[PDB]
Write a protein that binds this ligand. Structure first.
Ligand SMILES: Nc1nc2c(ncn2[C@@H]2O[C@H](COP(=O)(O)O)[C@@H](O)[C@H]2O)c(=O)[nH]1
Ligand SMILES: Nc1nc2c(ncn2[C@@H]2O[C@H](COP(=O)(O)O)[C@@H](O)[C@H]2O)c(=O)[nH]1
Lengths: 114, 117
């Protein structure tokens, strides 16, 4: 059940890719929600965070280490930012290939609508 | 940087109720829960901010997520769904300078950002 994210990874549909290595691809979100909104995803199809196992841990860590790098080069590192992963209906997960959202460029919070 | 109370939680130097701990990570309930499940997963090493992460941390960072997934399932929220959030510095609203992943769930969580601008 490949999603559009695998075609993005493979440069078979256009996207603004900001970083890629053998574990991870990062690209700008097509419907951004903050001045910076970048997605960082594993190059392998893992549909939900429920599907992760210990073998994925390096790629999972790289997603965070890559978001940090990207936060710096976006000029958002000092003022700050948020990283978010959504899972299933309560999380609002829309694409079934795991993704960390990097959000920033302005004060962001609260974590959840009250 | 100096240690936060989380260090004393991890080291069991302070009274606590740890939900999970291994070589790499520790998890415990937030003191001010923002959802029916609100559990923090943190590395056992002081990393003040996400800006302080390096390659050598990638295994512990990955463990934070595989552990979040394990806890979400133990909590009965894995199928319904959940959010993992990490906050950094002022714009993220980071209150404690030891990195933490928030596992939030137990209800429909609303928009990913309530202030959507
Ligand atoms: N660049 C790009 N972004 C997408 C595409 N499809 C979805 N997105 C973005 O990625 C997010 C999907 O992550 P999820 O909703 O699964 O957490 C959505 O917020 C959406 O804005 C796409 O085909 N191209
Ligand atoms: N159990 C517990 N939770 C705390 C303590 N101090 C802060 N917290 C929770 O952990 C979060 C700190 O993470 P941050 O705000 O840095 O993302 C806060 O939202 C707060 O609710 C504490 O001493 N004990």
């Amino acid at each position: 059940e490949e999603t559009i994210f695998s075609k993005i990874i493979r440069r078979e549909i256009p996207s603004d890719i900001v970083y890629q290595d053998d574990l991870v691809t990062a690209f700008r979100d097509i419907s951004p929600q903050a001045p910076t909104h970048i997605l960082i995803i594993p190059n392998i199809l893992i549909p939900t965070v429920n599907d992760v196992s210990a073998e994925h841990e390096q790629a999972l860590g790289r997603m965070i280490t890559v978001a940090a790098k990207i936060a710096e080069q976006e000029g958002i590192a000092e003022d700050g930012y948020r990283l978010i992963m959504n899972t299933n209906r309560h999380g609002g997960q829309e694409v079934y290939h795991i993704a960390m959202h990097l959000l920033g460029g302005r004060p962001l919070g609260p974590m959840l609508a009250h």
